[PDB]
Design a protein around this ligand. Sequence first.
Ligand code: SF4
Ligand code: SF4
Ligand code: SF4
Ligand code: SF4
Ligand code: SF4
Ligand code: FCO
Ligand code: FES
Ligand code: 3NI
Lengths: 447, 277, 179, 72
Amino acid sequence: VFKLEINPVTRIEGHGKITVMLDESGHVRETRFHVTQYRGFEVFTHGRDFREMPVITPRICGICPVSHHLASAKACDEILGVTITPAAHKLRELMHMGQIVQSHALSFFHLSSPDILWGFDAPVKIRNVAGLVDRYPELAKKGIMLRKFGQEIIKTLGGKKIHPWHSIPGGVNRSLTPQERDAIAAQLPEMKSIAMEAIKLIKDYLQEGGEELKEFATLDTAYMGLVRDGYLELYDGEVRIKAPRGRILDQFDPKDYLDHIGEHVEPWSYLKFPFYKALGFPHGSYRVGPLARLNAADAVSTPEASKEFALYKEMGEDGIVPYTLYYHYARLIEALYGLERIEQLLADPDITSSDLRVTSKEINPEGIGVIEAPRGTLIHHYQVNESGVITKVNLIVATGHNNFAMNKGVEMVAKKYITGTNVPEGVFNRLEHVIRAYDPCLSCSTH
Amino acid sequence: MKEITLTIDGKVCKGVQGDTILDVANKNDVYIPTLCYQKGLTPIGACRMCVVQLEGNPKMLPSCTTPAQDGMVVVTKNEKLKDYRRQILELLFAGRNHFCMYCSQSGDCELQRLAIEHEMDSVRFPYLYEDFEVDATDPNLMMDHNRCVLCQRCIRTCSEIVGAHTLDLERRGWQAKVIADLGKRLRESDTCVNCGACAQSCPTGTITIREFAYRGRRSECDAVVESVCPLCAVGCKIKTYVRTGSIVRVEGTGVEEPDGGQLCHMGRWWLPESTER
Amino acid sequence: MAKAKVATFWLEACAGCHMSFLDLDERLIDLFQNVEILFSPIVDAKDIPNIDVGVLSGGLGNVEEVELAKKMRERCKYLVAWGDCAVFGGINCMRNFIPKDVVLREGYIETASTVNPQGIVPSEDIPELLPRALPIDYEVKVDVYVPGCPPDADTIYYVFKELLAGRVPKVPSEMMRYD
Amino acid sequence: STVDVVEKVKEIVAPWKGKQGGLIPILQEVQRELGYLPEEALLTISRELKMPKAEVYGVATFYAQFHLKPRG
Ligand code: SF4
Ligand code: SF4
Ligand code: SF4
Ligand code: SF4
Ligand code: SF4
Ligand code: FCO
Ligand code: FES
Ligand code: 3NI
């Protein structure tokens, strides 16, 4: 007859609200996860020039502004019909790797580590980064330093840490110099050591409470990712959706997304529900993010991340791990990959190059930019006129894809741990950790 | 005499009997806030930011239009003047819609610099949210009227310096607007030569050259070199701005010569477009 | 036992200002030894306690943010506005030229990739968008303004050290930026 | 007809060519004989007096007596 509301969900980005509806006998029958913010970036961007979009769109989120920057840059690039210099490609990929590193470090160390180290039943006042630096100071400063590495890469490339500006329509504005290149390269060993320490921590956490942590909000769905020929790619590539059992279903090209993805609207959330169109809703809904990426990708291109990708693949069947709480693990793998990817970019003598712009005089009516933000796939779609004025905007961001998975996981833990009324603050914390495993950027979702 | 002397900020300054106070101030080094003043154009008197008062006389005089007369003491900085100038800036911000986050001139705008120098951190006024037209019909120049101070330096540059009298003021009052010929968009106007003298004269980010947006900020350049435009025989003096091995902005030095700094479409479009070939 | 009671939140922000708070990397560790952080987007407190310094980010777009700003105002003595979204209104005010109905409709019905032949707009269990997005100096009384998008880490740290030393600071003109 | 107003305002600007002033009386008399100032009238006034279109539109929209659209 009554309701439980955890709003506002804490230690996540954005404004969320979990609502469980209990029946007369005191049992869970329905549970929802509402996103309670909206600004209208798809609407108030009309009439602006397209070259203005790589600066407006980063204001969607401050955890992943580089992702929106790069997607807008790609969309304007396809509006100009330019194919960017190899150097600009590498610098954009370096900035994307910095963003991946910083976002995963933030989402593991500052937002979810208390529930990994102290458990879901720790006191409330100590379950935060303050209590963490109080009791586990080395780990807190390690995560802080990793995020510093990522954001200082973003700063040396794009002037600022939050909302940087590096990517113009046509290419890239700045290049690295030998001094700052070596200054970045000399910092990679301790960052790899921090990533391996975190991987150790999460692996022991998952093996300790082994199987109960495998049923925590686990639901078999499809997995979407970006892939090169067969490899995990975060900047370019094709979109690949894998059925819940390994079979590849509709691997396509990013610009052909209106033929494959559709968004269903529900009255209780400003967040939409994207789904594969050929299977409808809510059957075509899939997962995005580190877990879905490592499930859809077949191999990786860096040694020490492959040595752990193998151990990750031998955790589930068919090269597929459906467990929600393994997201953390997968996330760290990506961070590791990111670091190693930087070590391949800094070693290329076209990072300190000078040919970075491909300027053209041509305005095409459509431009689509699809990249791999840390939490999943990010699609920008701009439609302009012949004057270069924005006529239509369409965004589909990462956490939005994971909305159905979050709802189902929250409902599962709701009618698994809620016994009746008088619910302690250890059952609500699990109702929030099922959301925190996906680490949602609720500002990205409701752009 | 043709040789007068004043005292601005206690500092004794020299000048000629024909000039204004702002000219005597700029002649030595002395600083006075200005937004509608442009070297090479007849003083207008619109922003009222150059206000200045003398000892004894409680009136406030616009330093850019009032002549200099030997024996007068000039005060540029005090509590009253700071308050009035901050109120003018807050009016300008609350009237129009200034979004510095994505402005192309968000680091080299005269209004923004005047607001930061006066420590503006609130507007104190109800923020009239009016709908102003953004004209991006011309592929090269953009006019975003959300950022207009109505200094008229664009209407004075296309009239006395260029001759292509394409710009003027529409309906009077608060509904004042800078229009093209007969209220048309810039692309429909036939009396435009696409010289960009208006973009160089605009102090805010209303008129903007589109293809070099966010790159042609004079504040984030690497070097400034002055040379001559090779394309034609006139040989206009330029002020090339270089950023990462690329020309991002070409501005016309020579606001004292009869050309007035207006360069042709070639001089300020092809030259920065040439460095990216 | 002599710790302050800083409590922060975001109303209609993009998390950018709180992420610029979080990049005070070593300054964060040496600040936590001088500040205990009650209700905040990075702690698990659900309701605002009685505090000393209250920090708000973002503007006012929903009917929930207004009440939350009023709560943070009543519960503190020194309020700090973070970012242009709270000080000037910021990018949210880009939707104050289109009616709320048109915003919601063209964002949930008219966009491509959207499939709802019913014509549903999100209108249940969630707060309703205000007719206009406004700064926080419309419903509360701000003490310290920190403009930017987002403010630099040095500015946030300066304001913190000044407020925890006992003086109400004003952002100096050599470090003020509207971005 | 849009062709009638051309010559009809030609005959109103005739007594004013090369007289250094008198533009608001021209507009006043085109308002008296048409009730409003159409775009064709303003274009022809600009072409006859060789005064820029921006100037004539600025002075036509400065005063409340004039009207740029047909009045009720
Ligand atoms: S014109 Fe100047 S004050 Fe106005 S938004 Fe642009 S940078 Fe800010
Ligand atoms: S481009 Fe030249 S002619 Fe056209 S409005 Fe600007 S200054 Fe006048
Ligand atoms: S467009 Fe620029 S120069 Fe012209 S009136 Fe407006 S602010 Fe002044
Ligand atoms: S700017 Fe134009 S007019 Fe001047 S010298 Fe160069 S080509 Fe000739
Ligand atoms: S001012 Fe900028 S960084 Fe701060 S909340 Fe608003 S959009 Fe985000
Ligand atoms: N992560 C993230 Fe933001 C989201 N979702 C992007 O891109
Ligand atoms: S600058 Fe002196 S009045 Fe405009
Ligand atoms: Ni995000």
